Amino acid sequence: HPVLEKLKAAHSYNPKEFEWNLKSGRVFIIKSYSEDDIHRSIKYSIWCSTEHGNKRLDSAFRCMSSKGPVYLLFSVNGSGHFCGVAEMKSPVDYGTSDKWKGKFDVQWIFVKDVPNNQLRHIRLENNDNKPVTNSRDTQEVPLEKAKQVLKIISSYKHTTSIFDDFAHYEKRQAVVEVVRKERQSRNKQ
């Protein structure tokens, strides 16, 4: 599969060393609606949250302007694992450019399944001491606990990725586009 080979050659997924001991920065949970959205995000380096989520992330990125990075810890709802880590790279663009209303740039860094039981011992004092694995979308992670999460995700010797199913997602999306196009045609009549 050529798209995945292009993506892996052009970007440096799952670096073997990663500075997790962040001197500055902000870290947030991302809860995706689906694997398809993750696949689309890795392929096109974009993300979109809800309206509320986008406002929070836009504000954080703009407040971090030159001081340090904004990291996104991805997990699809009800999945039982995190699927990767990406860096936020731009503010939110609301201009007209069809399922996502805004968008911002991300750089996917880790694409690897890290099970939730590797992280449940880390709790968020700013979210009623619940496990970081029980977070809502765009929940901010305090820097020290974020260091621990990034260290575990960075080091974890994973068995699978969403990449293991790349062709599957490529086909799903392709079939969807045909389905949409023909349906749209039946409604043009």
Tell me whether residue 181 is annotated as binding: no
Q: Are 16 and 183 in contact (CB under 8 A)?
A: no
108 known member of a binding site: no
48 marked among binding-site residues:
yes
27: tokens are 């870290």
Task: Please check if 83 is assigned to a binding site.
Answer: no
**Is 32 labeled as ligand-binding?**
yes
20 is in an annotated binding site: no
37 carries a ligand binding annotation = yes
187 labelled binding-site residue: no
For the annotated binding site for RNA, the residues are: 31-33, 37, 47-48, 77, 100
Known binding residues are 31-33, 37, 47-48, 77, 100
